Coordinates of C-alpha atoms and ligand atoms in Angstrom, one line a residue:
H1 CA -23.0 12.0 9.5
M2 CA -19.4 13.1 8.7
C3 CA -19.4 12.0 5.1
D4 CA -23.1 11.8 4.4
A5 CA -22.9 13.6 1.0
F6 CA -20.0 11.3 -0.2
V7 CA -21.8 8.0 0.5
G8 CA -23.1 6.2 -2.5
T9 CA -22.1 4.5 -5.7
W10 CA -20.4 6.8 -8.2
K11 CA -19.3 6.1 -11.8
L12 CA -16.5 7.9 -13.7
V13 CA -17.7 10.2 -16.4
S14 CA -14.7 12.3 -17.3
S15 CA -10.9 12.4 -16.8
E16 CA -8.3 15.0 -17.6
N17 CA -4.5 14.7 -17.5
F18 CA -4.6 11.3 -15.7
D19 CA -1.9 9.8 -17.9
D20 CA 0.5 12.5 -17.0
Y21 CA -0.4 12.2 -13.3
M22 CA 0.3 8.5 -13.4
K23 CA 3.6 9.2 -15.2
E24 CA 4.5 11.5 -12.4
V25 CA 3.7 9.0 -9.7
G26 CA 5.9 6.5 -11.6
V27 CA 3.4 4.2 -13.3
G28 CA 4.9 2.2 -16.2
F29 CA 3.7 2.3 -19.8
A30 CA 1.5 -0.8 -20.0
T31 CA -0.2 -0.1 -16.6
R32 CA -0.9 3.5 -17.6
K33 CA -2.5 2.5 -20.9
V34 CA -4.7 -0.3 -19.4
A35 CA -5.6 1.6 -16.3
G36 CA -6.3 4.8 -18.2
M37 CA -9.1 2.9 -20.1
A38 CA -10.8 1.8 -17.0
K39 CA -14.2 3.4 -16.0
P40 CA -14.3 2.6 -12.3
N41 CA -17.3 2.5 -10.0
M42 CA -16.4 4.3 -6.6
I43 CA -18.4 3.0 -3.7
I44 CA -18.2 5.0 -0.5
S45 CA -19.8 3.8 2.7
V46 CA -19.6 4.6 6.4
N47 CA -20.2 2.4 9.4
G48 CA -19.7 4.2 12.7
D49 CA -16.3 6.0 12.4
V50 CA -15.0 3.7 9.7
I51 CA -15.1 4.9 6.1
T52 CA -14.7 2.4 3.2
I53 CA -13.9 3.4 -0.3
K54 CA -14.1 0.7 -3.0
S55 CA -13.1 1.0 -6.6
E56 CA -14.2 -1.7 -9.0
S57 CA -13.1 -1.9 -12.7
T58 CA -11.8 -4.3 -15.3
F59 CA -8.3 -3.1 -14.4
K60 CA -8.3 -3.8 -10.7
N61 CA -10.7 -3.9 -7.7
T62 CA -9.4 -2.0 -4.7
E63 CA -10.7 -1.3 -1.2
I64 CA -9.5 0.9 1.6
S65 CA -11.1 1.3 5.1
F66 CA -9.9 4.0 7.5
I67 CA -10.7 6.4 10.3
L68 CA -10.2 10.1 9.7
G69 CA -6.8 11.4 10.9
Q70 CA -5.4 7.8 11.5
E71 CA -2.6 6.7 9.2
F72 CA -2.8 3.3 7.5
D73 CA -0.9 1.1 5.0
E74 CA -2.2 1.0 1.5
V75 CA -1.1 -0.9 -1.6
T76 CA -2.2 1.4 -4.5
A77 CA -3.6 0.1 -7.8
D78 CA -0.2 0.6 -9.4
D79 CA 1.4 -1.5 -6.5
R80 CA 3.1 1.4 -4.5
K81 CA 3.3 0.6 -0.8
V82 CA 2.3 3.9 0.7
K83 CA 1.4 5.4 4.1
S84 CA -2.0 7.1 3.8
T85 CA -3.8 9.6 6.0
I86 CA -7.3 10.8 5.1
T87 CA -8.9 13.9 6.8
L88 CA -11.9 16.1 6.3
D89 CA -10.9 19.7 5.7
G90 CA -13.7 22.1 5.2
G91 CA -16.0 19.4 3.7
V92 CA -13.2 18.1 1.4
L93 CA -11.8 14.6 1.9
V94 CA -8.0 15.0 1.7
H95 CA -5.9 11.9 1.1
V96 CA -2.1 12.1 1.4
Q97 CA 0.0 9.2 0.3
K98 CA 3.7 9.1 1.3
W99 CA 6.3 6.7 -0.1
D100 CA 10.0 6.6 -0.9
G101 CA 10.4 10.3 0.2
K102 CA 7.6 11.3 -2.3
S103 CA 4.0 12.6 -1.6
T104 CA 0.8 12.9 -3.6
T105 CA -2.5 14.4 -2.5
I106 CA -6.0 13.3 -3.7
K107 CA -8.9 15.5 -2.8
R108 CA -12.6 14.5 -3.1
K109 CA -15.2 17.2 -3.3
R110 CA -19.0 17.3 -3.7
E111 CA -19.9 19.8 -6.4
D112 CA -23.5 20.1 -7.5
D113 CA -24.5 16.4 -8.2
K114 CA -20.9 15.4 -8.9
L115 CA -18.1 14.0 -6.9
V116 CA -14.9 15.6 -8.2
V117 CA -11.5 13.9 -7.5
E118 CA -8.4 16.1 -7.9
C119 CA -5.0 14.6 -7.5
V120 CA -1.7 16.3 -7.5
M121 CA 1.9 15.4 -7.5
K122 CA 4.4 18.2 -7.7
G123 CA 2.9 20.4 -10.4
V124 CA 1.0 17.7 -12.2
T125 CA -2.8 17.6 -11.5
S126 CA -5.6 15.4 -12.8
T127 CA -9.3 15.9 -12.4
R128 CA -11.7 12.9 -12.5
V129 CA -15.4 13.6 -12.3
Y130 CA -18.0 11.0 -11.1
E131 CA -21.7 11.0 -11.1
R132 CA -24.2 8.9 -9.2
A133 CA -24.6 5.4 -10.5
Ligands
WFO201 C1 -7.5 9.1 -9.1 C2 -6.6 9.2 -7.9 C3 -6.3 8.0 -7.1 C4 -7.6 7.4 -6.6 O1 -8.5 7.1 -7.4 O2 -7.7 7.2 -5.4 N1 -5.5 7.1 -7.9 C5 -4.1 7.4 -7.8 N2 -3.1 6.7 -8.5 C6 -3.5 5.7 -9.4 S1 -2.5 4.8 -10.3 C7 -3.7 3.8 -10.9 C8 -3.4 2.7 -11.9 C9 -5.0 4.1 -10.4 C10 -6.3 3.4 -10.9 C11 -7.0 2.7 -10.0 C12 -8.1 2.0 -10.5 C13 -8.5 2.1 -11.8 C14 -7.8 2.8 -12.7 C15 -6.6 3.5 -12.2 C16 -4.9 5.3 -9.5 C17 -6.0 6.0 -8.7 O3 -7.1 5.6 -8.8

């Protein structure tokens, strides 16, 4: 029951400062422009201790599966090869990605009927708000 309130299908309804966040992570111009237009569907499911997060859009379809606290290899949508660890901290899903001596943190939070995604790299944050599909 660890992620019960996160499970579902969610659709992107707002974004703020995502272009600048992508710049900070190193995404190139053309990818930023095309990816920034996407309106992904985020599909979160749990089966035993394994959590799966899928993101489907015209830009790219991605999928990660993981166990909380257990590091895994991820190829991000912008093709970084990162080491990811996802934990639950006080009801917030906290995803840290490490690569090339850099780090970024992506937090997912349930707030009212929304799922709010906050990602941060150095001082640059973006907030992406999802609602139930
Ligand atoms: C929002 C934080 C984080 C995440 O959703 O887990 N996250 C982090 N970095 C990047 S770079 C990039 C190109 C996407 C991206 C993926 C699919 C569709 C559009 C953009 C992305 C991303 O989605």
